[PDB]
Structure formats: structure tokens, C-alpha cells
Write a protein that holds these residues in place. Structure first.
Motif, PDB file in Angstrom:
ATOM      1  N   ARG A  89       0.758  -1.318  -0.062  1.00  0.00           N
ATOM      2  CA  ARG A  89       0.133  -0.072  -0.049  1.00  0.00           C
ATOM      3  C   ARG A  89       0.727   1.170   0.078  1.00  0.00           C
ATOM      4  O   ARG A  89       0.703   2.428  -0.607  1.00  0.00           O
ATOM      5  N   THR A  90       2.074   1.207   0.738  1.00  0.00           N
ATOM      6  CA  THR A  90       2.584   2.407   1.157  1.00  0.00           C
ATOM      7  C   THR A  90       3.953   2.638   0.341  1.00  0.00           C
ATOM      8  O   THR A  90       5.114   1.926   0.582  1.00  0.00           O
ATOM      9  N   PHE A  91       3.942   3.313  -0.722  1.00  0.00           N
ATOM     10  CA  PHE A  91       4.940   3.233  -1.734  1.00  0.00           C
ATOM     11  C   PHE A  91       5.683   4.613  -1.699  1.00  0.00           C
ATOM     12  O   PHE A  91       4.987   5.681  -1.438  1.00  0.00           O
ATOM     13  N   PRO A  92       6.783   4.780  -1.848  1.00  0.00           N
ATOM     14  CA  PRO A  92       7.696   6.163  -1.840  1.00  0.00           C
ATOM     15  C   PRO A  92       6.997   7.085  -2.899  1.00  0.00           C
ATOM     16  O   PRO A  92       6.466   7.008  -4.040  1.00  0.00           O
ATOM     17  N   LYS A  93       6.930   8.226  -2.415  1.00  0.00           N
ATOM     18  CA  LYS A  93       6.721   9.411  -3.631  1.00  0.00           C
ATOM     19  C   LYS A  93       8.111  10.212  -3.502  1.00  0.00           C
ATOM     20  O   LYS A  93       8.871  10.199  -2.766  1.00  0.00           O
ATOM     21  N   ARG A  94       8.064  10.931  -4.657  1.00  0.00           N
ATOM     22  CA  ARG A  94       9.294  11.695  -5.056  1.00  0.00           C
ATOM     23  C   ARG A  94       9.673  12.622  -3.765  1.00  0.00           C
ATOM     24  O   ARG A  94       8.659  13.275  -3.392  1.00  0.00           O
ATOM     25  N   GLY A  95      10.835  12.852  -3.571  1.00  0.00           N
ATOM     26  CA  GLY A  95      11.303  13.676  -2.354  1.00  0.00           C
ATOM     27  C   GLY A  95      11.180  13.138  -0.918  1.00  0.00           C
ATOM     28  O   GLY A  95      11.646  13.757  -0.159  1.00  0.00           O
ATOM     29  N   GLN A  96      10.509  12.131  -1.030  1.00  0.00           N
ATOM     30  CA  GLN A  96      10.676  11.437   0.546  1.00  0.00           C
ATOM     31  C   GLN A  96      11.869  10.639   0.580  1.00  0.00           C
ATOM     32  O   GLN A  96      12.363  10.110  -0.357  1.00  0.00           O
ATOM     33  N   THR A  97      12.321  10.732   1.846  1.00  0.00           N
ATOM     34  CA  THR A  97      13.454   9.558   2.339  1.00  0.00           C
ATOM     35  C   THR A  97      13.125   8.355   2.388  1.00  0.00           C
ATOM     36  O   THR A  97      12.258   8.116   3.268  1.00  0.00           O
TER      37      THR A  97
END
Length: 107
Positions: free
Chosen positions: A13-21
């Protein structure tokens, strides 16, 4: 450029978004299985911002396709890693790399 094969499922469900560490544990290996770099051998997770040009393309792209908690094998073409030059002494020319990566959390 990168092919992802799951070792252990994440939350899906929880995938990285641009700019996240992205906070990961990883081991990086040449095609022959020999480890050249590992956060596990350091006993300390590695952090990178998704979208910064610090980390190789395939590693970032592979991690973008992972969910929190997932462990996966990223097979990375030289096109998405160190290309024709490699990193002499460590990564040969035109090297395919394999990274075992676990996405621990996002910050």
C-alpha cells in the motif's frame, strides 16, 4: 533497466513518493554474487531522497516500486547503474548489479 523480484512482501500500500527519504537496508553485489557494499555489514540503515541524483537510477527506480516492509532483489542493468565506465577497482565496465534491498520506512 531494473527488474524487481520480491523476497518478502511489504504492506502493498505504502510506496515512496518523489522527495521522500527512503530508509533501507541493502547489500549490493556484482553478477557473480560477491558483495561490494552493504548497510547490513555496517549495521546501520542507509537513507536517500527519492529523486536526488546521488543514488544509481536502478536502485532508486527499484525502490519506488517497493512498499514499506518489502524486501526485494533488484537486478540492475549497467545502463541504470555505472554504465560503460563502471567504478574501476570496485565495479567493472558494463556490470549488471544485484541489490538485496529492504524498504524499512519513509521519512
Amino acid at each position: 533497466g531494473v527488474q524487481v523480484e520480491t523476497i518478502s512482501p511489504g504492506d502493498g500500500r505504502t510506496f515512496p513518493k518523489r522527495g521522500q527519504t527512503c530508509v533501507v537496508h541493502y547489500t549490493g553485489m556484482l553478477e557473480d554474487g560477491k558483495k561490494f557494499d552493504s548497510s547490513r555489514d555496517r549495521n546501520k540503515p542507509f537513507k536517500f531522497m527519492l529523486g536526488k541524483q546521488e543514488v544509481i537510477r536502478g536502485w532508486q527506480e527499484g525502490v519506488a516500486q517497493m512498499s514499506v516492509g518489502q524486501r526485494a532483489k533488484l537486478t540492475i542493468s549497467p545502463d541504470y547503474a555505472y554504465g560503460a565506465t563502471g567504478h574501476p577497482g570496485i565495479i567493472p565496465p558494463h556490470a549488471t548489479l544485484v541489490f538485496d534491498v529492504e524498504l524499512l520506512k519513509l521519512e
